[PDB]
Scaffold this active site. Structure first.
Site: not given
Lengths: 382, 382
Positions: A171, A321, A353
């Protein structure tokens, strides 16, 4: 000490007399992960270069294995700092004790991943990739900081120039790793990079902002604008000029001491960033618009020729996501593949996510373990 | 020392001489949350009662506030231990150092939640709700262990019997909290409960198993089976009898040292529990089938009259929960409301399991703060 009150985080007057990646000074680091692996850890103050190509000091954390594997191998771990305040930095966050305002970011996967690396006898580095300005999501700053942090580790541990280097990040940490990869060939060609594994890549600052704004995770959109502004003085000036009273409060807040990942997410759910300004064309005016065309890895958006790293890469994303858009990352990979990249691409159909972070951990690590041995699988790109 | 090598976790031969909630012994506890809050914390070994109505010893952790509020107020925090091994216990996990195998369950939300309580001058308790056999999801054991943990704190700090009590827990912790609520009126009638806030409630063991099996989080289904079997000797005998060679390896594994929440999740994704058993009709064979009817809060499925607590409750659930089914929790709420409950029901349409924990935290804490002041809103039930 808080980093705001610590000379180790300041740039000395003679910063220009040190080369990129060079160690200015070092100190012992009392870390959770080092204490739990019974290993020597250190903070390095090292010279790097900022977005405007100016010299600056930065901090990285390094763990030295007790039985170094031979030949020497290096592992660079990127934290999802996800915030625009200096006491949220990984260095401070890694130090022994619960009581760090961004502790959440160095306390879940980091201990497993870094422990994993250390057990196999690798040298580990995690840089404060946002730099002394805490410039979250500024890719050129993040990329150079990380590549210089790896340089600082080699220098400090007196390791061979060709020591094999691998990367991991998710991320925010994948944006960071992705930019280190992007800049490696031009900025640090001496790094022998045998693989980078990264997931939930925010490939485009602009796309990620639009995907996040007004949603549950709108805080990260705010933090991203904060972060870019800290890397680009002309952007800071422009953004400050558009902020209304509420916007001025928010941008002070998101830059305030202790305002870290939990604060970011839980203070701003469903906020509309445009309500902080009187400029609904925020992203579409200079200097912001041209800044965003530099701050993307998607060639169809970019104002420059996006590099195509050829070393093995392992990239994954949750299909649904809800935080970092799948389609921008898929577009990046397809583009990279069309120009000869080596991308082992893993789409997790069953995750969003946060669980993609969990479910990609072992696959990512298993792969990086193969890569270090020259055993990354030869697979069709993407 | 590891709880497995610590006599503090064993039941003494004269356990039957102690009353439920009586402190058998106490010891200073060096905890993360104690240190960050600069507060005294202790482990209490106390007497409680197991599923077969026999006396046993259990452990709970207590935090004493520096400036106690008047009249005394108690906050009971339930951890999502989510595992069937003693060294995954909350007590051990609360201790300083990261090298606790189930550390992830006490270092994300726990510091925020328990810190909040201590700053209000609340006495805080978190019991090892799974008890000394680590019987994950055994409702009667969890409930009695929690209610006695609160008795233990009252006795140790010598608090008025009618000190107002509030509860918080999410997911596995909401199961524990829900069962504390379920049993309060019959088991610990003296407790003065002013509020319970819990989300992601697994209301039915059967329904959650059916929701989890063969999916990404199938690991929790396996640990649930392990847990019930640890609470019920006749279930243990039955299940062990049906296990094939694969199953036997799995049940040793899911009960082994250090096999905690991360190992449960990552080891078993997409497992079908039936592959471990010779019994396609497991849920409908005795003694499992009757056990499941005792181990539900959903009256429509239950073989006993489910209590309907009358005190203020705040319950939330992710509409898109991919781990714990919304419908069983919503049914529980509807049934309770038709029988006079007071449930402030909060449905999050934008979240899944993990994001519901994150975004329900502040609403749940805000509500509990009102509850302690006698200010919980009058709302239509459910």
């Amino acid at each position: 000490a808080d980093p705001n009150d610590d000379l180790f985080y300041t740039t000395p007057d003679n910063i220009n007399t040190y080369a990129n990646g060079q160690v200015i000074q070092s100190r012992k680091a009392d870390t959770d992960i080092g204490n739990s692996n019974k290993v020597e850890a250190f903070q390095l103050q090292y010279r790097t270069t900022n977005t405007q190509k100016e010299a600056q000091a930065n901090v990285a954390t390094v763990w030295i294995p007790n039985k170094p594997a031979s030949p020497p191998k290096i592992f660079s771990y990127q934290v999802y700092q996800d915030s625009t305040q200096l006491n949220c930095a990984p260095s401070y966050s890694f130090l022994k004790g619960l009581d760090k305002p961004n502790k959440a970011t160095t306390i879940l996967e980091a201990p497993i991943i870094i422990g994993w690396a250390l057990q196999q006898g690798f040298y580990v580095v995690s840089s404060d990739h946002e730099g002394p300005r805490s410039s979250f999501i500024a890719g050129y700053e993040e990329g150079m900081a990380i590549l210089d942090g790896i340089r600082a580790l080699k220098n400090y541990a007196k390791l061979p120039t060709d020591s094999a280097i691998g990367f991991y990040g998710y991320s925010g940490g994948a944006h960071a790793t992705g930019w280190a990869a992007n800049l490696a060939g031009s900025y640090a060609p001496e790094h022998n990079i045998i693989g980078a594994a990264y997931g939930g890549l925010p490939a485009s600052a602009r796309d990620t902002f639009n995907f996040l704004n007004k949603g549950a995770f709108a805080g990260f959109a705010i933090a991203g604008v904060s972060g870019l502004a800290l890397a680009y003085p002309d952007v800071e000036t422009y953004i400050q000029s558009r902020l209304n009273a509420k916007g001025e409060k928010v941008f002070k807040q998101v830059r305030s001491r202790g305002f870290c990942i939990g604060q970011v997410v839980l203070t701003y759910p469903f906020v509309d960033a445009y309500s902080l300004i009187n400029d609904t064309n925020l992203l579409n005016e200079e200097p912001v618009a041209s800044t965003l065309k530099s701050e993307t890895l998607v060639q169809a958006e970019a104002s420059y020729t996006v590099p195509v790293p050829k070393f093995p890469r392992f990239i994954w994303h949750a299909l649904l996501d809800e935080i970092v858009p799948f389609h921008s990352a898929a577009t990046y990979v397809k583009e990279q593949c069309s120009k000869g990249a080596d991308i082992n691409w893993n789409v997790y159909s069953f995750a969003e996510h946060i669980s993609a972070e969990l479910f990609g951990l072992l696959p990512g690590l298993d792969w990086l373990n193969k890569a270090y041995k020259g055993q990354a699988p030869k697979v069709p790109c993407g």
